[PDB]
Design a protein around this nucleic acid. Structure first.
Ligand SMILES: [Mg+2]
Ligand SMILES: [Mg+2]
Ligand SMILES: [Mg+2]
Ligand SMILES: [Mg+2]
Ligand SMILES: [Mg+2]
Ligand SMILES: [Mg+2]
Ligand SMILES: [Mg+2]
Ligand SMILES: [Mg+2]
Ligand SMILES: [Mg+2]
Ligand SMILES: [Mg+2]
Ligand SMILES: [Mg+2]
Lengths: 109, 47, 215, 119, 122
RNA sequence: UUGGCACCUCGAUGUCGGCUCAUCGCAUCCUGGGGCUGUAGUCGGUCCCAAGGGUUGGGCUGUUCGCCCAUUAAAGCGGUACGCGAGCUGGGUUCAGAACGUCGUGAGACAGUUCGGUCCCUAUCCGUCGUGGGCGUAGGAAAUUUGAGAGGAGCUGUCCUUAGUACGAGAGGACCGGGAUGGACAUACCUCUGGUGUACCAGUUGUCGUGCCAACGGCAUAGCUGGGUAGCUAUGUGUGGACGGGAUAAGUGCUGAAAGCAUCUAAGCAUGAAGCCCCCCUCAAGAUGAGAUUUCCCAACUUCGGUUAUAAGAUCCCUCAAAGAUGAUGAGGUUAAUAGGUUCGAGGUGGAAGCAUGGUGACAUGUGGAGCUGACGAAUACUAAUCGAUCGAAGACUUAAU
């Protein structure tokens, strides 16, 4: 544990029911945004690269190619702005973190 | 990087005045007839 | 106003409203029972001095300073509380109220009262030129033997001195500093801590007095 | 974490100091070795209190492969010593917590010699 | 960041293919940049045809720098290519068919003719 | 600046540019305040008071200077041995080599070019930036403090509201008050983003060794690559520049004679600036003019010669660290949680070894999110902080209020 009293303030804001997984999975993260006359909600496919630093300050990130460009997006996973996480496919990787995706056909299986 | 002046017989003795040595602890053993140094153990003491 | 005397324990993040993440320093504010106060009638400045975390009883064989002494015994018997470790003036506020011997509270504030913070620095030992003050180093190649020292200090012999206030290598030092206009995102009562916004000086298990702002 | 000289030595010297602690049971040395060798040979003989094969391999990470013995006119290979004559001796709760006792300085230097004792 | 003399694979359909930034225009002594600022820059490569020609100083908005940007919730958008869009000095591009998915942050700075003319915007 | 004179220096006063670091004038470049305009408004010219703060990145040449590109609110002029080589480069100038033009019949010459050319020093005293011991402060000690003084900080743009209104036909387009976020700079701090992380974890290469296979050490920059906790940091996260007062400078004013009118002035009364002082933060009673409040301790020898020998309170000495060059600052010393260990946990790594199954194998899969863990958190006296010593007050006189 961190202390006896960090989490005593902080466990009351930690978020429940986010299906725990591991780097190598393939995610479809929805997220609510606002723009003008909309509270529209947007999907975002991708592959988890890394997952880090547990507690209320825990963090993961995902990577998706978009049109030839590798968009990499990062979230603090307990935010109340993420809506729903699926797990499209399990993964078989050896390394924990996966920084070596600067290639063009990785295909983690 | 040289002296410009020989230092006289006042600033020789006034400079070295914080250059001494103090006595150490010197607590005696109960049955040594010999003074150990504090928080130590001698070779031929009551320590 | 209501100068509490908490100590830090660390720093975390707390998700505010709609999406906003704001970093938070958590300040453990233990018991604070007010000792004697001093006014303009006695000798001339209206102030409330406040204690902080207590220690054990008095006068056996004071190896440490977690035991009291005959000075701080009678100085703390006057308010009939346990002897203290940190006593600080507050000539900011309220000569009228705050009866002597009163625990203050933790909830004098609300989630939105802006505050200030006074605490000591880290202190990073004896460090040199381009790390203490914002000076820039020399060239690291093309032959120069001037990497990291400070440059010239003064002019030639129409000023045969070096002017004091010269910013030379000395100790980095822990001296006091006050950030201004931090705010409180959340107050706890039961676990007896508060929170602030951003980050305050003074490394963990330190000391920091906070008070109202002066905006 | 204190030091001696450099990173290659500070493992291979310091592991070759607990070996001489094992076959002699008291040695004298200076401070910053003996303040620091306290917390390696004592952490090592938690592996005495487990004493299984998975702990046998990790005891070969530290001790020498060396220092045959002759106390019973026969060869105990100094890995078979600590699992029969040290782990059997100790069953107190904090492993094999050893004592130190300080002495005076030395002649040509000013380091305080200190007998450690495996008790 | 993108600073004094970077080199940028531009994203427009307007003849340039690589530009280099002389100045990051903004305040005095401005050094760095990120998505939504405007840099002045002179082309080096040139597609045969197009609009602009090699050696013509043009002004141009920044899009998708390599380091991320911290939007105010805790997210980050790290791309994988420095890029650019040549503007008409009325906050609209030259050509029509800009490639290369664009960050959402350039909306408060009224660049909204780029966003509607673009593929997938995040 | 270019000179004139030869007064100091030849028993050596190192010489141009540039980097490092500033400090000072105002004949002001921006910003603040006004007069006057042949000032419609927005812009602009010219002049007065004003040093508080700001004053940019590149190409060219050794350059100074200069022209040129893109910006900015502006790219000010100068002094400080044409500031700064016991702080730095050496590109030129002023060393030996060689060559070209040229002058000299010749050796050689040139403020004409041209390529290559050794930059020495361990700080005595002042001056600095920090940091401790003795003594003073009419009894000793602890804690908190007042603040004479002294430092620090002072900069600005762009967008929107008033409004497309006043002026001006039309082109365009505010003064004055409010609302937003940017730039540069000065701080504080690692939760996030990254970097480092040399007793952590995993893969693999040669070769040697543990009698051999499996396992595992040694050495090869840490043998090499992927990652990584604490601590330290920026390109990362927050905060900052005040609001408000008092007298004025330029200027504008009211009342008003000298000098029956006018007239800002002579006596009075206004108003008026990023400027001065108080306000903001930091230090500061060695401020010998040594301040202030609360709390604790008070004796025998003895012609006070105080001989002493102690209290309060420290310290010597030890285990370390939120501190740290040593000393100093803090946390502790058995009635103990100060370190180390033991146990549990966070974080990190990524599924140990054996054993079994399958494959002729190379190796796959279960047992099992395993094993293994340096700095961070909690619990526990298991080892070590033992027994001792050293220093340390017993309160003068004067007159005054009683
Ligand atoms: Mg002259
Ligand atoms: Mg003459
Ligand atoms: Mg002579
Ligand atoms: Mg001479
Ligand atoms: Mg010379
Ligand atoms: Mg003037
Ligand atoms: Mg100035
Ligand atoms: Mg070039
Ligand atoms: Mg001739
Ligand atoms: Mg072999
Ligand atoms: Mg206990």
């Amino acid at each position: 544990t961190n202390h006896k009293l960090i989490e005593a303030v902080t466990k009351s804001q930690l978020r429940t029911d986010l299906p725990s997984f591991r780097p190598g999975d393939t995610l479809r993260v929805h997220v609510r945004i606002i723009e003008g006359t909309r509270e529209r909600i947007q999907v975002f496919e991708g592959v988890v690269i890394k997952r880090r630093g547990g507690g209320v300050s825990e963090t993961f990130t995902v990577r998706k190619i978009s049109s030839g460009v590798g968009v990499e997006r990062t979230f603090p996973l307990h935010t109340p702005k993420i809506e729903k996480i699926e797990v499209k496919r399990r993964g078989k990787v050896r390394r924990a973190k996966l920084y070596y995706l600067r290639s063009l056909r990785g295909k983690a299986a | 990087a040289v002296p410009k002046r020989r230092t006289s017989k006042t600033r020789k003795n006034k400079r070295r005045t914080h250059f001494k040595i103090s006595v150490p602890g010197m607590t005696e053993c109960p049955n040594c007839g010999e003074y150990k140094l504090s928080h130590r153990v001698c070779k031929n003491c009551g320590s | 106003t209501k100068g509490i005397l908490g100590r830090k324990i660390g720093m975390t993040q707390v998700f505010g409203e709609n999406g906003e993440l704001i970093p938070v320093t958590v300040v453990e504010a233990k018991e604070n029972v007010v000792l004697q106060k001093k006014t303009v009638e006695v000798d001339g400045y209206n102030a409330i001095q406040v204690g902080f975390e207590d220690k054990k009883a008095y006068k056996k064989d004071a190896k440490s300073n977690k035991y009291a002494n005959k000075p701080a015994e009678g100085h703390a018997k006057k308010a009939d509380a346990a002897p203290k470790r940190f006593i600080r003036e507050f000539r900011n506020v309220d000569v009228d109220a705050y009866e002597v011997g009163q625990e203050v509270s933790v909830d004098t504030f609300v989630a939105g009262d802006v505050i200030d913070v006074t605490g000591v620095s880290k202190g990073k030992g004896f460090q040199g030129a381009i790390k203490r003050h914002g000076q820039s180093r020399g060239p690291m190649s093309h032959g120069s033997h001037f990497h990291r020292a400070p440059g010239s200090v003064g002019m030639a012999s129409d000023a045969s001195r070096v002017f004091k206030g010269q910013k030379m290598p000395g100790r980095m030092g822990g001296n006091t500093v006050t950030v201004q206009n931090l705010e409180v995102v959340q107050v706890d009562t039961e676990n007896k801590v508060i929170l602030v916004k951003g980050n305050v000086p003074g490394p963990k298990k330190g000391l920091v007095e906070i008070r109202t702002s002066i905006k | 974490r204190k030091l001696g000289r450099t990173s290659d030595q500070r493992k291979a010297m310091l592991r070759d100091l607990a070996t001489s602690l094992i076959i002699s049971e008291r040695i004298e040395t200076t401070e910053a070795r003996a303040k620091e060798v306290r917390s390696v040979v004592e952490k090592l003989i938690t592996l005495g209190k487990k004493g299984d094969l998975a702990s046998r391999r990790n005891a070969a990470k530290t001790l020498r492969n060396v220092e045959i013995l002759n106390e019973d006119e026969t060869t105990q290979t100094a890995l078979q010593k600590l699992f029969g004559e040290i782990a059997e001796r100790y069953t107190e709760r904090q492993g094999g917590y050893t004592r130190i006792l300080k002495q005076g300085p030395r002649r040509g230097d000013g380091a305080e010699s200190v007998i450690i004792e495996l008790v | 960041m993108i600073q004094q003399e970077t080199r940028l694979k531009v994203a427009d359909n307007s003849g340039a293919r690589e530009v280099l930034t002389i100045k990051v225009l903004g305040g005095s002594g401005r050094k760095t940049a990120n998505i939504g600022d405007v840099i002045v820059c002179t082309v080096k490569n040139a597609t045969p045809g197009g609009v602009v020609k090699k050696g013509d100083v043009v002004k141009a908005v920044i899009v998708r720098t390599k380091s991320g940007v911290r939007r105010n919730d805790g997210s980050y958008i790290k791309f994988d290519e420095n890029a650019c869009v040549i503007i008409r000095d009325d906050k609209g591009p030259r050509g029509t068919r800009i490639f290369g998915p664009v960050a959402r942050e350039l909306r408060e700075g009224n660049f909204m003719k780029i966003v509607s003319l673009a593929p997938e915007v995040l």
